[PDB]
UniProtKB/TrEMBL annotation, chain B:
Record protein name field: Ubiquitin-like domain-containing protein
Domain named Ubiquitin-like: residues: 3-76
Residue window of the full protein shown: 92 to 165 of 168
Family to which this protein belongs: Belongs to the ubiquitin family.
Subcellular location as annotated: Cytoplasm; Nucleus
Chain segments annotated as transmembrane: none
From TrEMBL, chain C:
Protein source organism: Legionella pneumophila subsp. pneumophila (strain Philadelphia 1 / ATCC 33152 / DSM 7513)
Pfam name, any one: MvcA_ins
Protein name per UniProt: MvcA insertion domain-containing protein
UniProt domain MvcA insertion: residue ranges: 133-227
Length: 149, 76, 384
């Protein structure tokens, strides 16, 4: 019955005007969940792969930020063990002036330019500074193994 | 209704604020800035292990006179 | 030959901060653990398994108690204490900031009215954001309690339109009874609306959207009346004395919450990279940063100066765009290099009491005693 006009109107413009390289569509049961696929950007270790993302809008959206997580297993220093993503904004806060589009774009640039220097608590950050040349290829291998078909 | 709360850092330093249960966490960050020179965007505040959010008030967290918050200066 | 004592301060600060990181604080590793154990003690529940919960609570914080602060303000505090000493640093803190003039001329003039060979200077900066209200609340006058209303919002009443600021002042935004009547009934029954939803503001479909947009226009029309500045970033610039006719150099020192530390800044040598543009160009870009209304230009400079090295094209894009204007303030003092080097040397003595052949060994020696100290304290307070 009721779901905010902002979600309705934003979902409209997301399917009518999608961003180059990304597919995003509402789940048919709960329209707050979004099945996302991002094509691995050109001349990146993840080139050729296609990565599936669950984007969820909590009840408090757009006063509260969405939560995003990788469903396709991926080798990247900014990804959780469960696939979750930062979305943390530096010396600012999520306001309803920022959209899902900006979220999807930031995740798209995050693949194009991983930032190992962040939380070192996971090993993938350690290998992404120690032997970066050897982290590019094991990410190419995980692209073939899990991001193809 | 000026009560008194404390703010401790990892270095052992204690800071004494004059506040009211009405004031927002953002307000006490601005009082930390007045005493320490730390900009509000450069600090987080913890009470009994719970991260405090900016819009909520001291009463919203049952923070009362002589309570001790903990200044957090890395991002968790 | 040798460098000046003022330049020696920079070299010692940077090289020590590069190598010793968290130890530059001078706090005994024992005290760090006792302090974190105080913050972690409630997360422990007596009813549960004690040690298992202690180790978990340790493991989750063990690697943050143990790395240096990210807070730009604290790093500036640390810099100020080392270069000035406790007493003069507190005096410096209570001298007041001045706003950077439109072209930076006021800071440029003070620098020029000092002999480069005679003096050593420390500039401390503070950069504010504009944090305007972002939601609109429609109440009836009977449901409006001005004492207790949530602050930093715009309030539409039947016959009035107030901006309530962060100190509890209620500013009349102007509109009279008829215009408020029109807006109040154009909207509807929701309690609160957004003032910054682009789908509401750029695709106005209903009369409610047109009314919220008109309230945004009324507010933006009067922005100069108010003060919604909030302190955001902090950094310092050290300008050591010259020898002979050599040209003057400036060095910016900073940390950044959620990003990097003073140690990261020095190891990346970004302080040196920025130094090469010269203080006059830096001030100019600092003036443009506060003068500009262009989001891309504001984001570009902010990233060039304040980003972790390497993230310049990424530090201020997408979710991190600088969409609100900024204000740059500063204050100036001379430092005494003898006092500064003394302070550094005392810190060196503290570092040297820690076992280890190399700096990496002493750091790791420090970090581990802090992990041990936290666990041992927690055990004592739970009476085990």
């Amino acid at each position: 019955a009721g779901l905010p006009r902002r979600i309705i109107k934003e979902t409209q413009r997301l399917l009518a005007e999608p961003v180059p390289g990304i597919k995003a569509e509402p789940d048919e049961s709960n329209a707050r969940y979004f099945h996302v696929v991002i094509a691995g950007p050109q001349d990146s270790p993840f080139e050729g792969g296609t990565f599936k993302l669950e984007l969820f809008l909590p009840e408090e959206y757009p006063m509260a930020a969405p939560k995003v997580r990788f469903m396709t297993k991926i080798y990247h220093p900014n990804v959780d063990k469960l696939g979750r993503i930062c979305l943390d904004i530096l010396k600012d806060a999520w306001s309803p002036a920022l959209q899902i589009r900006t979220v999807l774009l930031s995740i798209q640039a995050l693949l194009s330019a991983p930032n190992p220097d962040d939380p070192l608590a996971n090993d993938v950050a350690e290998q992404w500074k120690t032997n970066e040349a050897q982290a590019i290829e094991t990410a190419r291998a995980w692209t073939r193994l899990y991001a193809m078909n | 209704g000026s009560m008194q709360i404390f703010v401790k850092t990892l270095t052992g330093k204690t800071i004494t604020l004059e506040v009211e249960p009405s004031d927002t966490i953002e307000n006490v960050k601005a009082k930390i800035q007045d005493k320490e020179g730390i900009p509000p965007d450069q600090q987080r505040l913890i009470f009994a292990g719970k991260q405090l959010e900016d819009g909520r008030t001291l009463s919203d967290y049952n923070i009362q006179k002589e309570s001790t918050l903990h200044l957090v200066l890395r991002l968790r | 030959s040798l460098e000046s004592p003022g330049f020696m301060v920079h070299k010692k600060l940077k090289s020590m901060s590069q190598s010793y990181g968290v130890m530059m604080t001078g706090v005994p590793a024992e005290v760090l653990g006792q302090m974190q154990a105080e913050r972690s003690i409630p997360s422990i529940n007596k009813t549960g398994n004690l040690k298992q919960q202690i180790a978990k609570e340790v493991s989750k914080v063990c690697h943050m108690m143990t790395e240096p602060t990210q807070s730009a303000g604290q790093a500036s505090n640390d810099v100020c204490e080392l270069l000035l000493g406790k007493i003069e640093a507190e005096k410096f803190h209570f001298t007041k900031y001045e706003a950077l003039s439109a072209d930076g001329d006021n800071l440029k003039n003070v620098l020029e009215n000092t002999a480069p060979s005679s003096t050593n200077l420390l500039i401390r900066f503070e950069i504010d954001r504009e944090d305007p209200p972002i939601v609109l609340v429609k109440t009836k006058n009977e449901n409006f309690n001005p004492e207790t209303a949530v602050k930093n919002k715009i309030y539409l009443l039947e016959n009035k339109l107030y901006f309530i600021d962060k100190m509890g002042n209620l500013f009349n935004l102007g509109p009279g009874k008829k215009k408020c009547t029109q807006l109040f009934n154009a909207i509807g029954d929701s309690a609160e609306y957004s003032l910054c939803d682009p789908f509401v503001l750029e695709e106005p479909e209903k009369p409610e959207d047109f009314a919220i947009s008109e309230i945004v226009d009324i507010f933006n029309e009067q922005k100069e009346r108010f003060d919604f500045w909030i302190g955001s970033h902090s950094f310092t610039i050290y300008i050591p004395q010259t020898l002979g006719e050599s040209p003057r150099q400036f060095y910016p020192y900073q940390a950044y919450f959620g990003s990097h530390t003073l140690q990261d800044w020095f190891v990346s040598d970004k302080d040196e990279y920025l130094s090469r543009i010269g203080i006059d160009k830096y001030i100019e870009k600092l003036a443009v940063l506060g003068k500009t209304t262009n989001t891309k230009e504001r984001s570009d400079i902010y990233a060039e100066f304040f980003s972790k090295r390497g993230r310049e094209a990424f530090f201020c894009a997408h979710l991190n765009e600088k969409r609100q204007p900024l204000r740059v303030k500063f204050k100036i003092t001379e430092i005494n290099p003898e006092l500064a080097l003394k302070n550094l040397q005392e810190t060196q003595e503290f570092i040297d009491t820690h076992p280890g052949e190399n700096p990496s060994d002493k750091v790791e020696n420090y970090r581990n005693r802090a992990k041990l100290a936290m666990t041992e304290h927690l055990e004592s307070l739970l009476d085990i």
